[PDB]
Enzyme design. Structure first.
Site, mmCIF file in Angstrom:
data_model
loop_
_atom_site.group_PDB
_atom_site.id
_atom_site.type_symbol
_atom_site.label_atom_id
_atom_site.label_comp_id
_atom_site.label_asym_id
_atom_site.label_seq_id
_atom_site.Cartn_x
_atom_site.Cartn_y
_atom_site.Cartn_z
ATOM 1 N N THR B 45 0.872 -1.275 -0.026
ATOM 2 C CA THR B 45 -0.003 0.232 0.006
ATOM 3 C C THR B 45 0.854 1.295 0.081
ATOM 4 O OG1 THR B 45 -1.281 -1.270 1.580
ATOM 5 C CG2 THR B 45 -2.083 1.084 0.929
ATOM 6 N N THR B 46 1.722 1.349 1.009
ATOM 7 C CA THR B 46 2.729 2.594 0.890
ATOM 8 C C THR B 46 3.498 2.421 -0.358
ATOM 9 O OG1 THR B 46 2.831 1.970 3.525
ATOM 10 C CG2 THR B 46 4.504 3.556 2.594
ATOM 11 N N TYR B 135 -3.231 -9.619 5.394
ATOM 12 C CA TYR B 135 -3.077 -8.358 5.559
ATOM 13 C C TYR B 135 -4.583 -7.968 5.914
ATOM 14 C CZ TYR B 135 -1.949 -3.454 4.651
ATOM 15 O OH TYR B 135 -1.859 -2.151 4.468
ATOM 16 N N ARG B 140 -9.439 0.386 4.634
ATOM 17 C CA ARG B 140 -9.162 0.593 3.221
ATOM 18 C C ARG B 140 -10.045 -0.150 2.570
ATOM 19 N NH1 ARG B 140 -4.845 3.580 1.603
ATOM 20 N NH2 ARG B 140 -3.113 4.022 3.496
ATOM 21 N N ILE B 205 5.248 -4.038 9.929
ATOM 22 C CA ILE B 205 5.323 -3.580 8.533
ATOM 23 C C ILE B 205 4.962 -2.139 8.867
ATOM 24 C CG2 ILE B 205 4.548 -3.745 6.272
ATOM 25 C CD1 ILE B 205 4.211 -6.817 6.774
#
Ligand SMILES: N[C@@H](Cc1c[nH]c[nH+]1)C(=O)O
Ligand SMILES: N[C@@H](Cc1c[nH]c[nH+]1)C(=O)O
Ligand SMILES: [Mg+2]
Ligand SMILES: [Mg+2]
Ligand SMILES: [Mg+2]
Ligand SMILES: [Mg+2]
Ligand SMILES: [Mg+2]
Ligand SMILES: [Mg+2]
Lengths: 296, 296
Positions: B45-46, B135, B140, B205
């Site tokens: 995502t990042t 995850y 989101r 993470i």
């Protein structure tokens, strides 16, 4: 502005042995046309857009366009994406394959800011010359297109003509049409079709119309004629099925209902979607019993 | 089970003139390795996974794999999707390009049921022979992987070894490790790294580690060594920056901070992400002032 309004159906996408059942798809669209629907939405959420290939999306849109040729029914193709370059690509694609307009869902998962949503939709609207309907569904996307952003996009972009609202937020519907009464507010939540139309909304993009197109058509047309007593009566009759069709994530219940009615051959979904629980299967079957479901 | 745990960094993807700045990417990863990081997460995502092309994802994964060769640092590649067939393909792709394991986000937007999530991850796990970290980030995705589903997947699928939790719900974290103490719980929420680790979580993470990899590695390693006092002290020092890095949707603040620190050349994002508000820009710069940011 050029618009696509009225009674509209978010089409299910029937599968047979893992592939799009193209004949079934055409037949279902004809059934919608014959029961008074004004537009069909191929490959929207209800159509399992997320899991169709480019080739499957092209096929579905082309079938919708070909089946609606020679009628008054419009094709409002789902073309949204959470990547702006992809959403631009899908918009151009839909236009090139004959669609009358596009439905474009707010970017899901990556949560753009309002500035980002503005630039996203500005890019899409500048890429094609057909109507663009925004689509706000925060419970699925993780973000909300604010009233101010919707109003700026409508005012700044010639093809952006309204929003399909699936936020369960009648206050937002008031805010939108009180400050920008020229936009087409479209109900994206069947249970509250009548309240949205009675506030000046101009159409629905319906799940329930897959099963009861005649009832959703009448509801919407009564309301557009300001026969609110008749539109509310239908909305009230429809409440139980409108709610049971979300006992599990749409389109799991509506496909189940279509299968139970004999309108599709196979109860298949594409992963991660799958059949409902046995309990929900029985609840859907029981609620259906009070409604008259049209055949082909 | 084979596992990938410890201090891990969700890598930003720098752009210059609209393209992935490969050199910058390699240089940022070497900087993580040199500051004690145990594993790197390309294209999460990042990393703006949603808007990268397949060629760009391949490039990021291979640069990560190549930069970690000859070191203990593992590559845990983002490979999730909301379409099971696409997620299976992305897992195979990640393995083919040298990844040590995969991070696989819960399907976003289409809201599968727990049954569908079980079948989704079962298909992925059976498709590769490398570790799979689930995850969960419901804010989101619009759905939650329940504790029961996570535990069934961990017990039923050899390769599934734990979950990155980004749900702001320490209760869930207790529930998970109280009923299944063998799984690897990984913090996906920097502000609460120390509470998750102190409850038996085995790594992070991190977003913050892009900017402050030495502090996040030290925090994580103190906690794994049961020096809770030291771990909590760094967690407390990091609170202000951990929070300001979410003043707008991640990765908008972290890339902005990286730019302000001179660690990347250009403040570029891919639409629909975009630069922050001027106010937020100032807020990020203000919060950075109390921290010591390592260079190259
Ligand atoms: N599954 C991804 C990409 C895609 C859309 N349709 C088919 N694939 C998404 O939902 O955006
Ligand atoms: N944007 C779609 C497909 C995609 C991922 N990366 C590039 N495109 C998604 O988020 O699933
Ligand atoms: Mg009309
Ligand atoms: Mg026509
Ligand atoms: Mg949400
Ligand atoms: Mg303006
Ligand atoms: Mg009339
Ligand atoms: Mg402990």
């Amino acid at each position: 502005k050029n618009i696509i309004i009225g009674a509209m159906t978010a089409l299910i996408t029937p599968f047979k042995n893992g592939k799009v059942d193209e004949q079934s798809y055409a037949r279902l669209i004809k059934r919608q046309i014959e029961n008074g629907i004004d537009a069909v939405v191929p490959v929207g959420t209800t159509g399992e857009s997320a899991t169709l290939t480019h080739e499957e999306k092209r096929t579905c849109i082309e079938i919708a366009v070909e089946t609606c040729k020679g009628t008054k029914v419009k094709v409002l193709a789902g073309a949204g994406s959470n990547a702006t370059h992809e959403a631009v690509g899908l918009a151009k694609f839909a236009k090139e394959h004959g669609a009358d307009g596009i439905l474009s869902v707010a970017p899901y998962y990556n949560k753009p800011t309002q500035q980002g949503l503005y630039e996203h939709y500005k890019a899409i609207a500048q890429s094609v010359d057909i109507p663009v309907l925004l689509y706000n569904v925060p419970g699925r996307t993780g973000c909300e297109i604010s009233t101010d952003t919707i109003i700026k996009l409508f005012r700044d972009c010639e093809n952006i003509y309204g929003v399909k609202e699936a936020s369960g937020n009648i206050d937002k519907c008031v805010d939108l049409l009180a400050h920008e009464p020229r936009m087409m507010l479209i109900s994206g939540e069947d249970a509250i079709n009548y309240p949205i139309l009675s506030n000046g909304g101009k159409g629905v993009i319906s799940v329930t119309s897959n099963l009861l197109p005649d009832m959703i058509s009448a509801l919407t047309h009564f309301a557009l004629d300001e026969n609110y007593k008749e539109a509310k009566k239908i909305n009230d009759e429809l409440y139980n099925i409108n709610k049971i069709l979300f006992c599990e994530s749409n389109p799991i219940p509506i496909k189940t209902a279509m299968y139970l009615a004999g309108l599709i051959e196979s109860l298949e979904f594409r992963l991660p979607l799958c059949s409902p629980s046995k309990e929900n299967f029985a609840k859907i079957e029981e609620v259906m019993k009070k409604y008259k479901i049209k055949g082909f």
